[PDB]
Ligand binder design. Structure first.
Ligand SMILES: COc1ccc2ccc(C(=N)N)cc2c1OCC(N)=O
Length: 246
């Protein structure tokens, strides 16, 4: 997250912190994710496509720091890593950039809802918020494009939804951004999601209710002028989510 503010997991209790185990025992942060039901975390396929071995991943719920244990955090393995069969990557655009992670503790249980661990409601079909609506993003991603390390503390920011027509303008992404993608940025281009925030939530308040409107997917640079953050539009994927969670 470029700009924005440091936060803690109690303000984002659906946020999942996903890491990968390496040969030799080192574990590095991969991507964010969101708890949509006690057994299921929703993230982005590009996060896992080059390393699709479910056994390598660790997911945390109720965790506020990158390399520290948060009081009340819960650790899980991935029982099932489901990547979208039609995921593809162009030079910039990532297609069908959605994934599901069935989580389990070492005792074989799913998440236990608490003050710092909660689900995020899925959106309804054909009912996304209008362009101009402010939404929040969360992640452990870079604070500057030039950084090679991630912040130790979780961050959050607020961005505004950009219409498909604006995002398809030639100085923006042209025909590379599709109707299955949602653009969101800062009108002053000072705050954004960045590398490391992929898979994480774009949460919008719709008719007074908090919803997982998007999933961090792709963008040209970070907080660059006319280069919005591009998010997987979750409302298009409700038939796919419902079919793979049962
Ligand atoms: C691999 O790096 C990523 C991966 C995912 C991203 C996702 C979103 C954004 C954004 N500008 N909001 C930037 C991202 C990003 O940085 C853009 C880049 N490397 O040019």
């Amino acid at each position: 997250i470029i700009g924005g503010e440091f936060t803690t997991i109690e303000n984002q209790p659906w946020f999942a912190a996903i890491y990968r185990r390496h040969r030799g025992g080192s574990v590095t942060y991969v991507c964010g994710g969101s708890l949509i039901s006690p057994c299921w975390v929703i993230s982005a396929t590009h996060c896992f496509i080059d390393y699709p071995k479910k056994e390598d991943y660790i997911v945390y719920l109720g965790r506020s720091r990158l390399n520290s244990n948060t009081q009340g955090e819960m650790k899980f393995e991935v029982e099932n890593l489901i990547l979208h069969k039609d995921y593809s990557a162009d030079t910039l655009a990532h297609h069908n950039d959605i994934a599901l992670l069935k989580i389990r503790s070492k005792e074989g249980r799913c998440a236990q809802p608490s003050r710092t661990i909660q689900t995020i409601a899925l959106p309804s079909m054909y009912n996304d918020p209008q362009f101009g609506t402010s939404c929040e993003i969360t992640g452990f991603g870079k604070e500057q494009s030039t950084d090679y390390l991630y912040p130790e503390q979780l961050k959050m920011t607020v961005v505004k939804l950009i219409s498909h027509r604006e995002c398809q303008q030639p100085h923006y992404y042209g025909s590379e951004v599709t109707t299955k993608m949602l653009c969101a940025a800062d009108p002053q281009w000072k705050t954004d999601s960045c590398q490391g925030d992929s898979g994480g939530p774009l949460v919008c308040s719709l008719q007074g209710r908090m919803t997982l409107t998007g999933i961090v997917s792709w963008g040209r640079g970070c907080a660059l002028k006319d280069k919005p953050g591009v998010y997987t539009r979750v409302s298009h994927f409700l038939p796919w989510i419902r079919s793979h969670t049962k």
